[PDB]
């Protein structure tokens, strides 16, 4: 069954050259320190990762590992990699500036309970703003444009 889902989502897995497949796997192992079983889990769960080039997958993983403070198991369980970087930064940064999110400290503790990752990403934007952040739709649109300008300057 795992092959069936992979074939449907990513028909080119057979067509892709050897080099391309190895790099995606090698990044997950040497640079991301994923275990053997998780590697099979990720490939089956989100086949689109194979299409994605390296040096973008590594950045996305480190964004969660360091900036968001997530752990290996959390990433695998929630299908974090499936989502796009733009969505991750737009939502996470908005919450962080509002003070509703905290990077876990060195000890591993947080003064305030952080919002569940499903609420941050899985839910719709309307529910996410209305419930998780309790903000206004107009403010988010302004923030997205402001964030775009900052990236351009960067």
């Amino acid at each position: 069954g795992k092959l069936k889902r992979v074939l449907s989502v990513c028909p080119e897995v057979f067509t892709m050259h050897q080099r391309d497949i190895d790099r995606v796997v090698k990044v997950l192992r040497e640079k991301c320190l994923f275990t053997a079983q998780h590697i099979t889990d990720v490939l089956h769960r989100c086949p689109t990762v194979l299409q994605e080039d390296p040096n973008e997958l590594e950045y996305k993983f480190q964004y969660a590992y360091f900036r968001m403070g997530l752990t290996h198991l959390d990433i695998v369980r929630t299908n974090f990699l499936q989502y796009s970087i733009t969505k991750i930064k737009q939502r996470h940064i908005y919450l962080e500036r509002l003070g509703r999110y905290q990077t876990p400290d060195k000890k591993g503790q947080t003064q305030i309970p952080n919002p569940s990752l499903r609420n941050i990403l899985r839910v719709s934007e309307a529910e996410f703003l209305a419930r998780t952040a309790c903000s206004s739709v107009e403010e988010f649109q302004v923030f997205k444009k402001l964030l775009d300008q900052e990236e351009e300057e960067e």
Binding site: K31, C32, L33, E58, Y59, Q62, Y63, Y65, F66, R67
Partner: protein, 227 residues
């Protein structure tokens, strides 16, 4: 100065004396830690090519008689002495082998499936799909190398053309030609894992030395701040 003890050139059923290593190479330096001592042991040569026709005999299926089922110090499974014609040889013993039984070694890829009794050796093609097997051979005529441990069995998942898919105990699937022999049934000593060592002295008997007393994701430049 180290000389390997594995120098005998002719097959026999007589026990052979073994020399221990200590975990040292032929140079004399430790290569593997945790090995040393134990009880003295004798080696009994096991023949893993089930379908070996006797000298000056044609290649057709033959039968053999089970003389003994015996404990072996060098393995987790138990072995059985089997005699046929004018020849005796050791082999591995399945779960339910008993003394005095007769067993069949076959060379015939039946166009239809051959009824399978535990312990008989048949080419993989003949056996029906889903039949447990052990002592599997990767290549025809090589000799068994997989699934020869105690209580372990494999499964014949599928057959297409002249190639079959086997499910190893680790569950990693594998494929081979259908012209390589295999023997039906699980390996003996199904309850090996249940043992309890009990005291430290028992491990020293088996030839195991104690452990030693002594007690990496690099962030990218944008990750340095929130490390």
């Amino acid at each position: 100065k180290f000389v390997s003890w594995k120098s005998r050139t002719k097959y026999t059923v007589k026990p052979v004396k073994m020399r221990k290593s200590g975990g040292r190479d032929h140079t004399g330096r430790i290569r593997v830690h945790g090995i040393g001592g134990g009880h003295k042991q004798n080696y009994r040569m096991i023949d893993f090519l089930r379908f070996r026709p006797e000298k000056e005999k044609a290649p057709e299926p033959f039968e053999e008689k089970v003389v003994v089922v015996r404990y072996d110090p060098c393995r987790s499974a138990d072995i059985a002495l089997v005699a046929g014609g004018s020849r005796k040889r050791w082999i591995i013993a399945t779960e339910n082998m008993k003394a005095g039984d007769t067993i069949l070694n076959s060379n015939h890829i039946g166009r239809m499936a051959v009824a399978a009794q535990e312990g008989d050796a048949h080419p993989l093609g003949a056996l029906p799909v889903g039949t447990l097997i052990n002592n599997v051979e990767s290549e025809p005529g090589r000799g068994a190398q997989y699934i020869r441990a105690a209580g372990t069995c494999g499964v014949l998942l599928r057959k297409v053309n002249g190639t079959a898919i086997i499910q190893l105990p680790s569950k990693r699937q594998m494929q081979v030609l259908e012209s390589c022999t295999a023997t039906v049934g699980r390996v003996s000593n199904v309850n090996h894992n249940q043992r309890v060592i009990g005291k430290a002295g028992r491990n020293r008997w088996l030839g195991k030395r104690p452990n030693s007393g002594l007690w990496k994701i690099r962030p990218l430049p944008p990750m340095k701040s929130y490390v």
